Amino acid sequence: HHWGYGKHNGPEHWHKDFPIAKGERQSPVDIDTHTAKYDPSLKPLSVSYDQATSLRILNNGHAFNVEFDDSQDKAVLKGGPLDGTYRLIQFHFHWGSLDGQGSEHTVDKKKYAAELHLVHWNTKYGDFGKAVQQPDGLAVLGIFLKVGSAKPGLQKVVDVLDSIKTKGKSADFTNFDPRGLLPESLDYWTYPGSLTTPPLLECVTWIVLKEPISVSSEQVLKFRKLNFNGEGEPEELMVDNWRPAQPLKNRQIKASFK
Template sequence: TVLRSGPLPGLYRLRQLHFHWGSSNDHGSEHIVDGVKYAGELHLVHWYSKYSNYAEALRNYDGVAILGIFLQVGKSPKPEMKRILEEINGIKTKGKEAPFSNFDPSILFPKSWDYWTYHGSFTTPPCEECVTWILLREPIIVSPDQV
């Protein structure tokens, strides 16, 4: 899966996706927009394909692009989240991974592709400053059980 265009100078390849969530339905997102925090935030981490690998991309200013999607709690579950949540249930400790293939992450995206963008760093240590952030303005709606 790739990401290109918009604020990006070339083709970025998907490395991994992960979620951030908190202890309540309004305190899980990494970003705050106009004072509003969301229940969670999905990050799709991509690296610039002009570099030979992800490690090299991390050492360069334009090396990484992260597509961030806010999670907002609603009444109905998002059916497209089912497979991911099944895999996540197998992760019980920090640092574990659940690799899987034949998955198109675009099924998780909201209808609108309007976004904010800025250059910054990862939100977790060592906080490399090589990230072009692309935050979709429209959140996806998930049920309380999916957060």
Template sequence: QFVCSLSSDDCHTHQSPINIWTKMALYDPFLKPLKIQYDPTTSRKIVNLGHCFNVEFDDTSDMSVLSDGPLNSRYRLRQFHFHWGSSDKDGSEHVIDGNVYPAELHIVYWNSQKYESFEEAAKHPDGLAVIGVLLKIGEANPVLQTIIEHLDDVKTKGKEHSFTKYNLARLLPNDLDYWTYHGSLTTEPYFECVTWIVLQRFSRPKFAYMNRSASYSREACASILVPVFL
């Protein structure tokens, strides 16, 4: 796994993202299939964080949860967001066999079976789980268009807008085979609290509106070309 070289205070031995070399990945027969439960009624709002936008969910109950796979607990859905770049060749955070993809979806969960809150969970090695899904450029798709249309409602930092009854399952591929590793947040304070689950298949909908999305990102982030949040 990637060892950060910025400073000894901020960087450790399990930093994310990483370059996944598929031929070096080890098959573990004891890993279970992912068990994902989404309730569209738990989606609440879209929020401009200044460097990125989040779609946030009601995480006060176990209505939208992730379990099994590499996990030993039940994890509650908190939010999802996208990473993209200034071109179609530098958007994804994770790299597969040296290949960077146009965009990456991150679906963020926290260990609600063991901890009382997201903030508390983020302090522990088994606190968070994130599903990473790579996206390609393609034709217009209504699943993503629904999100893109709401970006005009949250053009400035701190703005938020109602975003309800969104079926997140429609962003996932049919095949949920995955790579997994223990890693970190990709922004400060770089806590090594994340079980990463990177899907081996691309998202079903493709990122058709990357140009408009990138424009929004630059407006919201000033000089930041690649929005990063976890």
């Protein structure tokens, strides 16, 4: 398959190879804060990243992914809306060409400068590939980025991007602590949705944190120097790698907080 974010292969085209693009639980969505209902039955989220073991960073021609060892319960997400244990496999971001767009989820139609996705799979399904055959196979923790002060825990990521400029390039990225990417509060919204890139599979319990992290203009500027293209192809800056909000259909967004 041959998909991207431009006019000729972007989100409006995806449904041809991936008909689920027009499905009943697609992501992202707009989070209308006045329709999301506080659910007192939701447990606190448990983010257990102490033993996280990062492996590599990769430019896949769409975004960059930091990949983890998911063989054992090293870095897991539990609680909140989730039954059982979900293992961290990778994180990546979506961002804009300018600060007024870049997020996938929106909050009362507000677009943030970027959005971080920490992707986890349900350990009752044994591996990630099996998990994406299940409606509760994945849990993605989404975190908005706004431009302000630098996020120190992001800097190691920023510092390596020069080495993975183009599609297919990777670099060692062991000993990275994803706890440094989290805001103070774990207040969240949650709803059932999908992967936001092809193959757009409808497997995801979304957990979107209310509090954005702040990153510096210099940090996001370095994201925007990456390339979608491979080396030796015309340069196309990796910006605006976000899918717009999709129809909510018959879904409810729940809030963990009043």
